[PDB]
Amino acid sequence: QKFNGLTVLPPLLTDEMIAQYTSALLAGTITSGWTFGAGAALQI
Amino acid sequence: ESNKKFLPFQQFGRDIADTTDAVRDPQTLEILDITPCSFGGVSVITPGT
Ligand SMILES: *[C@@H]1O[C@H](CO)[C@@H](O)[C@H](O)[C@H]1NC(C)=O
Numbered sequence: 119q120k121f122n123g124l125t126v127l128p129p130l131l132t133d134e135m136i137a138q139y140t141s142a143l144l145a146g147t148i149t150s151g152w153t154f155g156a157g158a159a160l161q162i
Numbered sequence: 163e164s165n166k167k168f169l170p171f172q173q174f175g176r177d178i179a180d181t182t183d184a185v186r187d188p189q190t191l192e193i194l195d196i197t198p199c200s201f202g203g204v205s206v207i208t209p210g211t
Pocket residue numbers: 188189190
């Protein structure tokens with residue numbers, strides 16, 4: 119489609135940046151419960 | 163020069179949206195590719211005047 123003036127722009131976060139965000143949400147839940155989404159992570 | 167080879171009565175090629183993307187030279191029966199010349203946008207990053 120590049121012949122007629124159409125282009126595709128890349129996203130700002132890559133796929134490895136989004137995978138780093140979801141593994142930090144997983145580790146916070148497994149080690150702290152719901153405390154890390156309200157302040158400091160408190161282990162339990 | 164392309165890695166495409168087609169039937170000897172065909173002159174040029176088209177794709178899914180009917181854009182010409184290959185052609186045969188009418189003297190040396192060779193199959194050339196066609197790609198567009200380079201285009202794009204120009205963006206200016208300013209910290210504010
Ligand atoms: C056209 O003439 C050229 C002579 O330079 C020859 O190489 C080519 O094969 C010819 N094409 C034909 C007869 O289709």
